[PDB]
Amino acid sequence: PRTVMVNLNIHNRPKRSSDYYNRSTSPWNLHRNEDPERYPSVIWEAKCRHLGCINADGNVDYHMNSVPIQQEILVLRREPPHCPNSFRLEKILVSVGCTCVTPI
Amino acid sequence: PRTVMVNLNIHNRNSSDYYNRSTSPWNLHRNEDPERYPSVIWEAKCRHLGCINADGNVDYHMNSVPIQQEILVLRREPPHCPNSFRLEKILVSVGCTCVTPI
Numbered sequence: 001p002r003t004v005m006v007n008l009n010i011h012n013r014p015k016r017s018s019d020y021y022n023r024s025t026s027p028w029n030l031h032r033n034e035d036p037e038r039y040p041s042v043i044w045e046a047k048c049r050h051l052g053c054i055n056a057d058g059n060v061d062y063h064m065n066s067v068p069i070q071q072e073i074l075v076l077r078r079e080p081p082h083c084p085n086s087f088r089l090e091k092i093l094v095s096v097g098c099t100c101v102t103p104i
Numbered sequence: 105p106r107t108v109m110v111n112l113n114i115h116n117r118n119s120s121d122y123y124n125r126s127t128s129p130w131n132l133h134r135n136e137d138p139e140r141y142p143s144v145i146w147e148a149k150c151r152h153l154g155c156i157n158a159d160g161n162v163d164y165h166m167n168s169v170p171i172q173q174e175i176l177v178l179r180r181e182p183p184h185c186p187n188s189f190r191l192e193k194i195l196v197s198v199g200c201t202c203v204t205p206i
């Protein structure tokens with residue numbers, strides 16, 4: 001009912017540091033979600049390592065909370081299946097890291 | 105030049121105020137570009153250089169820093185062609201996390 005064309009070839013941004021994930025008070029890991037019926041097909045989702053957050057001393061402090069920061073994202077989904085380059089839009093949620101948080 | 109078709113009827117999916125309770129809270133700044141789809145984009149900005157205490161005072165021995173993501177956005181191509189588009193990859197701060205320096 002409303003349809004458009006898109007060139008998936010790309011240009012822009014170099015990178016670096018980005019071990020925020022390891023020095024955060026609310027650190028995380030990245031889990032690969034691969035779906036071949038989907039553009040992009042590889043997506044990296046963040047997952048908080050602890051319930052609590054990390055001390056100065058480097059011990060977990062459960063009076064606080066690692067929680068994930070999320071984003072609504074649009075992704076491409078094959079429509080109909082078996083059709084290698086026709087697609088519909090699909091909105092989804094993506095954890096991109098965790099932040100630490102006071103519970104009240 | 106690999107090219108594909110997209111139906112913009114978007115089904116399906118699928119308050120939480122972490123921005124205010126984070127040790128490394130932040131605000132959102134509007135970026136608007138009319139030659140861009142989406143045109144309005146909200147970018148996060150850490151409120152403090154340091155992070156917030158239990159006591160609720162700023163502790164500069166630590167660091168609010170933004171968490172970013174690579175994002176794709178659409179740009180008409182050729183310009184003034186209302187259906188055909190090219191991809192453009194962008195960085196987006198979506199919130200801040202607190203961090204131990206070196």
Ligand SMILES: CC(C)[C@H](NC(=O)COCCNC(=O)OC(C)(C)C)C(=O)N[C@@H](CC(=O)O)Cc1ccc(NC(=O)[C@H](Cc2ccccc2Cl)NC(=O)C(F)(F)c2ccccc2)cc1
Pocket residue numbers: 039040043044072073074075076091094112141142144145146147173174175176177178191192
């Ligand atoms: C992202 C929207 C879901 C959101 N809008 C809504 O909830 C409803 O959208 C109704 C208007 N947007 C719209 O039609 O999107 C297009 C005009 C596109 C068609 C919105 O506009 N948010 C914005 C305002 C704000 O809220 O601060 C912030 C925003 C901006 C762009 C993006 N970009 C995307 O989600 C794109 C979708 C896309 C865009 C352009 C070209 C190709 C593709 Cl596949 N996908 C990706 O970046 C990704 F798939 F690569 C991806 C995957 C995994 C992790 C990270 C990224 C995300 C969020």
